[PDB]
Amino acid sequence: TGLLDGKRILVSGIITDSSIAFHIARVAQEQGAQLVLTGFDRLRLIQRITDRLPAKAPLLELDVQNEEHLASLAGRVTEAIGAGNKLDGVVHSIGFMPQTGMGINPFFDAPYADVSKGIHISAYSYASMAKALLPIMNPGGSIVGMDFDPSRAMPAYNWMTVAKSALESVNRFVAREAGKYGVRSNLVAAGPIRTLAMSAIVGGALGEEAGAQIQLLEEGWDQRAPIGWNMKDATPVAKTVCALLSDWLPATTGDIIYADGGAHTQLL
Amino acid sequence: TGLLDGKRILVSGIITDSSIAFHIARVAQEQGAQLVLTGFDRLRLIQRITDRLPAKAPLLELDVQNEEHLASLAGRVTEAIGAGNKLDGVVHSIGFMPQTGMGINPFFDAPYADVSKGIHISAYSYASMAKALLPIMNPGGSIVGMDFDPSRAMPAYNWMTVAKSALESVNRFVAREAGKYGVRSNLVAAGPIRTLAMSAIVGGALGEEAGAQIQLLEEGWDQRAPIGWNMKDATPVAKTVCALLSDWLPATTGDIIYADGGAHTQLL
Amino acid sequence: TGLLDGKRILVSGIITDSSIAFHIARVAQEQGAQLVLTGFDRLRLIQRITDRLPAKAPLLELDVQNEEHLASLAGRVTEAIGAGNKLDGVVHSIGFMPQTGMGINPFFDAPYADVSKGIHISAYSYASMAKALLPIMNPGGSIVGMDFDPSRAMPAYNWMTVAKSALESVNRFVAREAGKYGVRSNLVAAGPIRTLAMSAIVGGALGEEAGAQIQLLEEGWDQRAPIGWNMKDATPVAKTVCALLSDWLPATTGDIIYADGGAHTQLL
Amino acid sequence: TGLLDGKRILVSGIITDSSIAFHIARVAQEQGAQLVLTGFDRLRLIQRITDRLPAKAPLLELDVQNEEHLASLAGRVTEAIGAGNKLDGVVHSIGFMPQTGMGINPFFDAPYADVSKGIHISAYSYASMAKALLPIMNPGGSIVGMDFDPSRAMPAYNWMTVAKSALESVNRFVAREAGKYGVRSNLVAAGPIRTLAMSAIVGGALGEEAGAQIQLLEEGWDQRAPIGWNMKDATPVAKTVCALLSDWLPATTGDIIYADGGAHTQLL
Numbered sequence A, B, C, D: 001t002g003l004l005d006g007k008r009i010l011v012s013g014i015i016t017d018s019s020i021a022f023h024i025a026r027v028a029q030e031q032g033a034q035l036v037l038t039g040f041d042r043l044r045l046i047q048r049i050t051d052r053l054p055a056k057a058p059l060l061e062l063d064v065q066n067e068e069h070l071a072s073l074a075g076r077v078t079e080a081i082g083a084g085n086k087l088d089g090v091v092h093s094i095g096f097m098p099q100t101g102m103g104i105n106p107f108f109d110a111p112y113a114d115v116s117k118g119i120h121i122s123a124y125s126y127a128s129m130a131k132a133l134l135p136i137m138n139p140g141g142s143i144v145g146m147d148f149d150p151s152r153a154m155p156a157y158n159w160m161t162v163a164k165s166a167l168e169s170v171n172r173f174v175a176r177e178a179g180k181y182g183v184r185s186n187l188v189a190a191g192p193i194r195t196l197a198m199s200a201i202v203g204g205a206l207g208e209e210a211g212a213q214i215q216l217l218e219e220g221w222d223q224r225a226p227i228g229w230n231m232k233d234a235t236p237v238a239k240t241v242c243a244l245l246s247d248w249l250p251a252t253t254g255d256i257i258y259a260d261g262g263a264h265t266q267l268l
């Protein structure tokens, strides 16, 4: 009955019940997946939030900048799912960029220390998670990361745009390695969604009238998308990730699927 | 429970049992879809062939160069599915190019009458099919066409490459129109499949070493594809089309999904 | 001293002194090129207009839909430049689309007869001109066509967008053939310029407030371009074509150079 | 009359006489440019090497990881060219990636400290160079960086591919900033050149069969390039950079010009 019935899927990146990762998890459970969740830093909050999911799942700590976390991850996952069992899916839904790299802060004024942290967490970690988890993935499995189309420059997105360009390149190399395991690796380039990162990171860096410029972003996206766009609903994006986690896109890898209402296909 | 359970899907483009359309149809039926078939010219042959599908489906005649077939199509489909009922999906799996625009035959020697017929059938008709059928499609519905990545030139594909470039452009305009119906329009860019068109029609224009060149094509595509590629197997491509016809990719339109083993994402 | 000193260059597509082809010619002559001009239909007007160029050049009739014109072209050119002499450059600056294929006229309502004519003239003719002229081009030579970025759908451009997508594919195949002669083939994707086609074809199809929507197009383009954009000046575009005609881009072929103020590299 | 007659151009990235920068510098000088050179670490060696350029040029030290070098660069360049004078051109020909992120060394085994150093030098520093030098550039000026098409993954280029993806994104944001100065920013995507970095640094990480693999690379690139390709010859690439530094591409910014023999436009 369910799209992901019996599949074992690790989902990273829940911070709140607005997180793209929250809705990926919710939809995957509705579709029968058995999940292992990973969280960063604010584990007490994340435990509270993940209790709003349809079903209980183990929560494991994972700071992608922490070499020890990464080194122990496959073992901790194997403890969570049981020896002899492997993952069928991995979801990377993780990003960060310091305020200097975002918004109205001048592009040239971001120190490399800041950019590097943003790139570590937002791009490099996709390789490092694939490295840790591929040895415990089943053939036919699927690794999915979250992208925002960086093909053209734009206001505010600034150095996160650079990190996503890097992520897209990483994805294609992860696909090379994953292929050896019979595993797919893809990115979902999503339209704008009202998440914590959108409000705290992107919004925080926009200065004043941020709420209006964000309302503006929604209205422009909605206009450009032939099927419209709603920033208040992550479900279409979560369903898309779930399609990639399923057996229904078996010949797609190294690739990007655009869950953006088709906005990137239209000039105006 | 099937991926496509309860959905009404029109599938064009069956001519042989090796046709991509034939496999899209089989998989759609295994996933619970009710089909309406359309066929060109050899309707007795198509009728016979499709008696070997999992389930019986009505078959209607459609020559996309015949403006009368196109003018009557919606009413004919309505009769086939029952008045009041609408289509949830449309599959355009239609291609033609005179052999003169293909193979070892010189690119410059294809006369425009030939090229134009190919473009008419291969690209323009995606818009005329959508024009005819959009008025009888449900919101949430899905139009899917078949592509072969024409972003780069290549031996032998010649003027068909040009027609696929046109088609990708047509798809994006179709999406604009389909969106007003709450309908999606996308293409599936498939890797090479050992269909009789590939082997016999195109392989027809390929010379005395055609068989070897086709095996060589397979070997190279399989090398390049991080997850491998089997030209003998249409199933991954048909599953990809079904994915688009399902409700699992609801924010994707005007777009292209590559079902090519990830080959296009790799240089070597 | 001149960029194109001693080079023999055929320039097609002058209709008025606002034509992109007019400015290509003007700039090429300023840079020392010896030109052969081709014109369509309105030869008396074109003769008057081409008398405003810095220097005299032979004018030859060429309707790209006329098989006889095309068949006699190399011979007529050889008569214009002298036996034993060959062309170093060819400029395709030609396009057409009937009103049904443009503007506010519904996309689905363009008859294929119309689209086909537009595609013949705007895309297919790039191959047919290359076919006629390559046998009289010097190695090191350069064929350049004019493009408008069709990667995304947009209002008004409609079926001309499809023709340019087709042109881009043709260009990459012409590059295959041209390479055998030691000749480059490239397209210049220009920003919007106030030419006859812009006003009569694009403007004519836009209905009412066309002048304001065109003013609007300029202002949006100017905003999106990091170095700004001026629709009233074709010179930056002509200089770009001249760069391609020169010896200064010797390793570029099958390709597209964007003379659009960088607008296509910016989302907003 | 030289292409670059009277222009003042800063050229970074000479380390050996096989350096792409070395050839850009030679060609620029043959075309009448006045150069300022910048070099990293081995300044005595660079001084010696560049004594073999057509013309003597001042050489300044620049480690792009040294924020003091970057803070003083504009003033140091001004002293070199004379106060009141400004630069017309800047060439970023700087790349680095620890061998650990290259060759037959496993993609997953490159530690982030290594990758980050590579990204810093290879991508971030394009923005910090532009930051430093924009204030002393003339309108109409041109910043040019060196790229290797990273749109697809590939053997051996590994993390450098990721850094070039980042760089292409950085280029587009640099263009936004440079436009306020009336300055252009573009990359040249070069085909493989048998520079000592290619052979010795990268070829260093390539195994016991490295030489053969490099010849194989050349043979395949030459096959794919419609106009052919010679890895032994930097001249076409240097001419391409000079083209961008000239006034002949004045509407192009935030962009990428492929000097690769047209290889990227061909599948096979």
Ligand SMILES: NC(=O)c1ccc[n+]([C@@H]2O[C@H](COP(=O)([O-])OP(=O)(O)OC[C@H]3O[C@@H](n4cnc5c(N)ncnc54)[C@H](O)[C@@H]3O)[C@@H](O)[C@H]2O)c1
Pocket (backbone or CB within 6 Å): A012, A013, A014, A015, A016, A018, A019, A020, A021, A039, A040, A062, A063, A064, A065, A092, A093, A094, A095, A096, A121, A146, A147, A148, A189, A190, A191, A192, A193, A194, A195, A196, A197, A198
């Ligand atoms: N919201 C949008 O509009 C949008 C659009 C396209 C793509 N995305 C992408 O979706 C993904 C999820 O972001 P979101 O929008 O759901 O916002 P979010 O705030 O809900 O999630 C971001 C996650 O990043 C995690 N994270 C940060 N640093 C980490 C670290 N060192 N280790 C482990 N995890 C870390 C945070 O814990 C948080 O859970 C990101 O890749 C984001 O770039 C978002």
Ligand SMILES: NC(=O)c1ccc[n+]([C@@H]2O[C@H](COP(=O)([O-])OP(=O)(O)OC[C@H]3O[C@@H](n4cnc5c(N)ncnc54)[C@H](O)[C@@H]3O)[C@@H](O)[C@H]2O)c1
Pocket (backbone or CB within 6 Å): B012, B013, B014, B015, B016, B018, B019, B020, B021, B039, B040, B062, B063, B064, B065, B092, B093, B094, B095, B096, B121, B146, B147, B148, B189, B190, B191, B192, B193, B194, B195, B196, B197, B198
């Ligand atoms: N076989 C491959 O490797 C491959 C790869 C990528 C894309 N494609 C595309 O997939 C689609 C299916 O091709 P296939 O390989 O299954 O070949 P096919 O010959 O089985 O299918 C082509 C269909 O086009 C139909 N057709 C031709 N003229 C028509 C007309 N005037 N009106 C209506 N229908 C007409 C034919 O009847 C046939 O049913 C085509 O668009 C093709 O370009 C094929």
Ligand SMILES: NC(=O)c1ccc[n+]([C@@H]2O[C@H](COP(=O)([O-])OP(=O)(O)OC[C@H]3O[C@@H](n4cnc5c(N)ncnc54)[C@H](O)[C@@H]3O)[C@@H](O)[C@H]2O)c1
Pocket (backbone or CB within 6 Å): C012, C013, C014, C015, C016, C018, C019, C020, C021, C039, C040, C062, C063, C064, C065, C092, C093, C094, C095, C096, C121, C146, C147, C148, C189, C190, C191, C192, C193, C194, C195, C196, C197, C198
């Ligand atoms: N004006 C712009 O904004 C713009 C932008 C990008 C690309 N372009 C391209 O520039 C090229 C030149 O157009 P333009 O804008 O200078 O307008 P234009 O009206 O000055 O030139 C169009 C030319 O097409 C020629 N032509 C039409 N049918 C022909 C035929 N059958 N045979 C031979 N020639 C024929 C006409 O004679 C005319 O000289 C076209 O390819 C156009 O698509 C224009």
Ligand SMILES: NC(=O)c1ccc[n+]([C@@H]2O[C@H](COP(=O)([O-])OP(=O)(O)OC[C@H]3O[C@@H](n4cnc5c(N)ncnc54)[C@H](O)[C@@H]3O)[C@@H](O)[C@H]2O)c1
Pocket (backbone or CB within 6 Å): D012, D013, D014, D015, D016, D018, D019, D020, D021, D039, D040, D062, D063, D064, D065, D092, D093, D094, D095, D096, D121, D146, D147, D148, D189, D190, D191, D192, D193, D194, D195, D196, D197, D198
């Ligand atoms: N060789 C090729 O085939 C090829 C192809 C495409 C692009 N490229 C690019 O061309 C550029 C030139 O490479 P090359 O092949 O001439 O190799 P190279 O080794 O001659 O040049 C690289 C330059 O990077 C400089 N550099 C390294 N670290 C630096 C630092 N911290 N500060 C300042 N400078 C530093 C080195 O000193 C050297 O001068 C690089 O960006 C490279 O990626 C090379």
Ligand SMILES: CCCCCCc1ccc(Oc2ccccc2C)c(O)c1
Pocket (backbone or CB within 6 Å): A094, A095, A096, A097, A147, A148, A155, A156, A157, A160, A191, A192, A193, A195, A197, A198, A201, A202, A217
């Ligand atoms: C106005 C800027 C353009 C629209 C932003 C849409 C967006 C919103 C949030 C996103 O997530 C992040 C962004 C930056 C840093 C970290 C994260 C998770 C993200 O990746 C994309």
Ligand SMILES: CCCCCCc1ccc(Oc2ccccc2C)c(O)c1
Pocket (backbone or CB within 6 Å): B094, B095, B096, B097, B103, B147, B148, B155, B156, B157, B158, B160, B191, B192, B193, B197, B198, B201, B202
């Ligand atoms: C030429 C070698 C390149 C690989 C061929 C892959 C392919 C095979 C068949 C295809 O379909 C057609 C092609 C031409 C004419 C008609 C059809 C259905 C098609 O569109 C693509």
Ligand SMILES: CCCCCCc1ccc(Oc2ccccc2C)c(O)c1
Pocket (backbone or CB within 6 Å): C094, C095, C096, C097, C147, C148, C155, C156, C157, C160, C191, C192, C193, C195, C197, C198, C201, C202, C217
């Ligand atoms: C509002 C539409 C989008 C901007 C149009 C810019 C433009 C203007 C003129 C062009 O030339 C032609 C256009 C259509 C048909 C024929 C030609 C020559 C052309 O190719 C492009």
Ligand SMILES: CCCCCCc1ccc(Oc2ccccc2C)c(O)c1
Pocket (backbone or CB within 6 Å): D094, D095, D096, D097, D103, D147, D148, D155, D156, D157, D158, D160, D191, D192, D193, D197, D198, D201, D202
């Ligand atoms: C790996 C095989 C792929 C072809 C290599 C072409 C190439 C060669 C050299 C290049 O420059 C560098 C690469 C890595 C580190 C430093 C430099 C300068 C570079 O950027 C690209």
